[PDB]
Design a protein around this ligand. Structure first.
Ligand code: B3H
Ligand code: B3H
Ligand code: B3H
Ligand code: B3H
Ligand code: RB
Ligand code: RB
Ligand code: RB
Ligand code: RB
Ligand code: RB
Lengths: 106, 101, 101, 101, 101, 106
């Protein structure tokens, strides 16, 4: 089934800088990728759906892009509340699967 | 009104119903089969439309036994419906023509 | 009963027969050709259905001369069958209409 | 002249119009969706033709909601048009035949 | 004999002719376009058959302007031919039925 | 034609442990993969069909998974009677072919 690779597993950036998390699918999944944020002790939170579509309640700072096998979740000017783990999840083919996760460090 | 026009309208309403139940049952049939793509409802409804008009690009199609059976029903319902319309247009044309003469 | 309805029923039974012999002969035609996928019966019967309704997603199709000839027969039998039904629905509609008047 | 022949001609002109607006609106609908291929007009017009004749090779197809809606309209317009022609050919044949007798 | 049956037979002979010229002209149209696959005659004739029955698996399709134009002609000739047969079967059914009564 | 690669060719596990045999196809074959067991001096025995479907008479301990190009045959809590060679076989495309085999060692 579809393997989603998130690398690097840890990303370190300077306050206010531009960060980009990467998710690579083992085969083509159009734009059927979704992004979640899970802070320490929290439950996952949907950030972007279908690779680039915004969700209500999520800061405008968050954006996504890509199609096919390569996907990026971007954060314009990262801040402290963004410190968390980030997961991608694909719904193109059964069963749904999750990437292994990227931790954001500031 | 005329029987042919009623059968047509009836077939169209029924088709819209088969497209919606067809989308629902396809997702239900296909989730659980590794590799299947007919698994979310918006694209399944689109799949149902292109199957009923027999266009079949595919971009999506069922891989399980029940998804395929559901596929055959959608095909048949659309082919029958579109056929019932042609047939009603012929009935209408035959009548007005016998008059024009 | 009415000839048109008999021809229809007859065409439907015949179609079911062409779908089954068609599945059997497609596998027989295609095994032996490197790369061919129309080689097990359950998926070939499904292939036969989608060819007869002319939907053709595709997910499967013949690559040999005889598999293609068998494909053309299935196509024609389905197109003719579905056409015979439309035609019978027109005959029925023309008659009841001449009555409604 | 005869109503059936006028409806036919009318449907053909209308189809040519749906094929052109359909090509225009498909590109308009699909540009902006990552991965979409129905994005330049010459190939979209070809896509419109193969959708209306319900041939659907697929080599191209819409991936957005509005491109798909535009696709359904093209399908229906072509299926209806081709059906209106069959129906007119039946009307013509029914008339000349009642004469031959 | 009856006009409808003559038009049918005529359409069938003409279809066989369009399938053969269509195969010839498709190869002629497509060789010279990098990546094209509709370039040898046996598979082009098969391509012509699946386009005329509007089945369109796809396994092959034209990528040039003239190959596509040739494709549209094959589509139309097959859709018209199969439609002329349905129409003739309706004419035949309408007549025998008026008799059965 | 379709090459089926089974690696490693020998797998060693501790009694009761979880074992996983891998089969990789040279191109995508949906779920048209089947698994066989052949004990020393025995004839092959069907264990799983179509990648994950169970067969009657086979211990519940045996399971399969995968779709596309990557397939796994799993054994939950291996025992001595499981010592054998294991083969995958594809029926997606003509001709049918077999993987080279993985030996289970305890
Ligand atoms: C109206 C015609 C519908 C045809 C549907 C064919 C489905 C084939 C299939 O996936 O069938 C899958 C199963 C095995 O999982 O094969 C069988 O033993 C079932 C016998 C048909
Ligand atoms: C009803 C229309 C059916 C058309 C079938 C075409 C099959 C083409 C083919 O694979 O043919 C393969 C062979 C070579 O192996 O080509 C030949 O010399 C045969 C001449 C047609
Ligand atoms: C005549 C029938 C036309 C069917 C068109 C289906 C388009 C599906 C789609 O992409 O829809 C995409 C959107 C999300 O972007 O799904 C929705 O919430 C819309 C509800 C249908
Ligand atoms: C019956 C309808 C047939 C439609 C055929 C469309 C062919 C498109 C194409 O490849 O056209 C290719 C060329 C460029 O090489 O585009 C043009 O400038 C031609 C204008 C249509
Ligand atoms: Rb079709
Ligand atoms: Rb088709
Ligand atoms: Rb198709
Ligand atoms: Rb296709
Ligand atoms: Rb038709």
């Amino acid at each position: 089934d579809i393997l989603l690779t998130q690398s690097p597993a840890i990303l370190s950036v300077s306050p206010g800088e531009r960060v980009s998390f990467s998710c690579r699918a083992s085969q083509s999944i159009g734009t059927d990728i979704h992004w979640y944020q899970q802070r320490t002790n929290g439950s996952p939170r949907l950030l972007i759906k279908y690779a680039s579509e915004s969700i209500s309640g999520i800061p405008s700072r968050f954006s996504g892009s890509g199609s096919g096998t390569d996907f990026t979740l971007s954060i314009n000017s990262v801040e402290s509340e963004d410190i968390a783990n980030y997961y991608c999840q694909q719904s193109n083919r059964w069963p749904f699967t999750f990437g292994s996760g990227t931790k954001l460090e500031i | 009104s005329a029987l042919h026009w009623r059968a047509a309208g009836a077939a169209t309403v029924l088709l819209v119903i088969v497209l919606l139940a067809g989308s629902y049952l396809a997702v239900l049939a296909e989730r659980g089969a590794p590799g299947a793509q007919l698994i979310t409802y918006p694209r399944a409804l689109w799949w149902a439309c292109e199957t009923a008009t027999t266009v079949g690009y595919x971009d999506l199609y069922p891989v399980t036994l029940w998804g395929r059976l559901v596929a055959v029903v959608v095909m048949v319902a659309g082919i029958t419906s579109f056929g019932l319309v042609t047939a009603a247009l012929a009935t209408w044309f035959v009548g007005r023509e016998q008059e024009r003469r």
